[PDB]
Amino acid sequence: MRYLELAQLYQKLEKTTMKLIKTRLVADFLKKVPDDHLEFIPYLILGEVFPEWDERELGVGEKLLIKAVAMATGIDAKEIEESVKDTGDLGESIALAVKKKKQKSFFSQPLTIKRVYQTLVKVAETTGEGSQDKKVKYLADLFMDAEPLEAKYLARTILGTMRTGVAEGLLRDAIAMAFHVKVELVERAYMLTSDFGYVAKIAKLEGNEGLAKVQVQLGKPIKPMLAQQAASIRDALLEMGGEAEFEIKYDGARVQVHKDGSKIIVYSRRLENVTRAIPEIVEALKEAIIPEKAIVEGELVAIGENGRPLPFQYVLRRFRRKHNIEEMMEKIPLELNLFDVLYVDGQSLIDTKFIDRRRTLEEIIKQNEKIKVAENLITKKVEEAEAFYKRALEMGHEGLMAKRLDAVYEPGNRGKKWLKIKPTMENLDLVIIGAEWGEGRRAHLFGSFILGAYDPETGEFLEVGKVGSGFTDDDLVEFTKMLKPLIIKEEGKRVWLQPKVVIEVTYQEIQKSPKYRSGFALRFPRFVALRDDKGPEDADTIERIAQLYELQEKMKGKVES
Template identity: 30%
Template sequence: MKVSTLSEYLDRLERTQSRNEMSQILAEVIREAEKGEASVLMYLLMGRVRPLFDPVEFGVADKQVMKAMVRASGVTEEALGAQYRVLGDLGLVWFAVAKSAGGEKMEVIFLYESLSQIAAESGGGSQERKLMLIEELLGKLTANEGKYVIRILLGKLRLGFSDKTLIDALSISEVGDKGIADKLEYAYQVRPDIGFLVQKVKEVGWKRACEGVGVALGTPMMVMLAARLKTAGEMVKKMGSVAVEPKFDGTRIQIHFQRRGDWKVKTYTRNLEENTYSFPELTKLGDVVDADSLVLDAEAVGVDTKTGKLVPFQMTMTRKRKHDVAEQAGKVPMVFYVFDVMYKDGVSLIDKSYEERRKILTKAVKKNDWLRVDEYKLVTKAEEITKLHQLQIDKGLEGVIVKKIDSQYVPGRTGWRWVKMKEAEGSTGKLSDTIDAVIMGFYSGKGKRAGFGIGKFLVGVRRGEQIVTLTKIGTGLSDEQFKQLKNALDKLVATKADESYVIDKTLVPDVWVEPKLVVEVAADEITISPTYSAGVSLRFPRLVKFRDDKSVQQATTIDEVKQMI
């Protein structure tokens, strides 16, 4: 496919806000793609050169790209800056000043290789080499093609669709409708690489691509998530015999291990970001496991070196910053509570039952102090669940996770396979569970908060691919947290509401932000509200903690909120 053809498709995608129309357009792209370029096209459509879990970045900012534009166009930096102040988009600036540039019929594969080369440049002098490569590339593109390439380089190719839309498009391209989208989505959740999936379907057809899909070592899979039920009685009624495990207040990690190979250990967050650097303890993993390769599901929890007790979530999350991991590892050592195994010695285990996986896990991990298989108990009665839940609360943990003993490991939150119970069951004055909400924007502060630049922030929950408003929050934060939140939100400021937002005009915030930051919220109760687009709101909402470990796709849905009523 020519880059000119791709840019025409991008034009069509940019002009529509209809998810169905986007799916149809993307289906056309997939049909037209040659087998050898299908994966490349998918990555470019997502504004990347690698799948989401591969941390490859271009490493250029607005100022650097503007310098390359000056060199490629001959327009002065002052003139470009003036245009940028008006348009707010360097892609549009290029379109305005470079209408006679380029004209070569570049192939998509060549564009991909050029972008990959820019991303790969590192070390001394790399920024100048990047500028030269960008200048050269822009000189080979038309104004419209360059517009999209600049947005890709800056991470700003926001066309309003997600990987889920691409899966729908893949289904349409194969069978004419979304009839096989569920099957394709499952294959994607096990191996979340949209380029790999589309390429595989193009090569062997959708049936063979989906058959026998299993865990791949070194590629993170979407983790299994717990649903919500109000009472232990409902859990027994819907799930039958269950296993009850403690729920730790740590950070969820997926651990990939191989005894031989070019890497030994890789870890990933629940939203597929590699964070191996955060856990230097795991370099010793080979000493405490009886396996040549493993994929483990675990919770990493910090330990107070003086008391031996588990520390709060915020202390555990200090490992998120690369520059001081070694220092933090000394201050807050980790214990890894392993509760599932998805792969062992070349065999994917996700189709096996919970009990079978547990037996394999117990044999695979040797007894040691820092990598522990967490305890569980098989029960059949509601009162046993309630008793075990209260026992964990008394220990200072969050509660329990209840798991169906004959359940396979199914990515995402589907059915009543895993259910979480937090807080004291039947408690009054507060919801029995928290809500993971997406920050949509914020309001200027008054009084002391005027100095922070933020007084309250607006949050929403998911409704399909939309984000609907739920509540404003201005309590539960210390002064330091207000400053931390403002710094984080400043990096996400947007000139207008994201296309996924559904919001009443009376709630429009002073500053919009991109939907990227998730926070955990507690409240006293859920109330009916005609103002908030969720149809409900929260009474006395308050921030519990920042959830840097969660993506927007893992935020609470409106259906889950309504189950709490």
């Protein structure tokens, strides 16, 4: 299949604002894709080369890209740069360079999707000595045969700036539509493997039966099972049927570990491969995990000099690797509190009752300085769990998790099989979808941020509030530098932003406002932290908010006596 057909799809996608039309376009295209392109085509359709959990990345910036295009077209980098000043878009200017290339090298050897994909992969894997020059050459080889339209999309694909309105929801729907399979099964398989390519392939070749048989695949992250919040230990035990597994709810960053022999991959909550950020934990895991193959997950916690937990922000700091891992391992010691096992030696435990998974976890983990098994208590006595809860809080943790003993693991689901019990309404993790410049001496900084809750089915982020409290001057400076590149529209003090930054905020109250489309509004939110271990698509949803609203109202309804 020619890359031109894919470029033509991108163009059609950009020419419609309609999700249903986009779904159709993508589905029709998926139907034409050769079977051996299915494993990667979904990502290319999203304008990405690899799944977010891959670790591989094209180490190509605007300059290197321009250099490759200049090399491929015979047009000076400066000229391409000067073109951007008139076009306002590098993609369009690259298309022009390629269009002009016709004068000196008129015939192209038509780009195939296969060649483009294989090239991008080679580029990403070229990190050796003179990786940069090699990447320029691979890309130049590609742009030499590109048609203008193709070049524009190849460029945006390389830069990660593709703007097709295709989100995971639409891609899921497109796969279901293209191969006449149940969207629920496409979703089930996606929650288990986080791999749209894998899911699409199976959908096409095996249909529903195949999708229903999909099991976790070692190395591919499983979307984490989430939890609803209960008002109290008592309420949690009641919901559980009178008995439950209780565990300390550790305040750190959730990670998922895949082990194959001595090979370890650790994924963060947003499924970023963060293995490289925590070498000491990886080493500890090779030792702590007994079975050759396993997938387990836990809460990675920063530990202070007094042995108590440090703020979870410290763990997220470790993930960003802004300082040398060497210094940070010293400055920010970590401990991983494992709380689930989803696979062991070729056997998926997703459909295994929790009690068996926990027993397996206890059996498979030889705890060490770094790797621990979450402390638990299985009880039917509210007072026992309450004592455990009190202790969890005195220990500096968040409270307790209560988990149904007979429940299977539900990838990506925020059900009631796992419940969180805390002393306060949990903070919301929302997407910054806009901001407003501050006033007076703060006019050069964003001083307020519009928060959006993610909508999976639609892919958009609906406004649920505006936070302008809790940020120190430095926070404002940092967020302004971080968000300026995301501006997509500006109007007075108001700026609209690409939905990419998730932040945690407290709120005085969740209000059910007829006002906004979301139906909700947060009363006086306050900044708590940057939650970059969560992608925009991992942010709290309207449903999550509605759930907290119900909890809030349930408690207000109980006020007095």
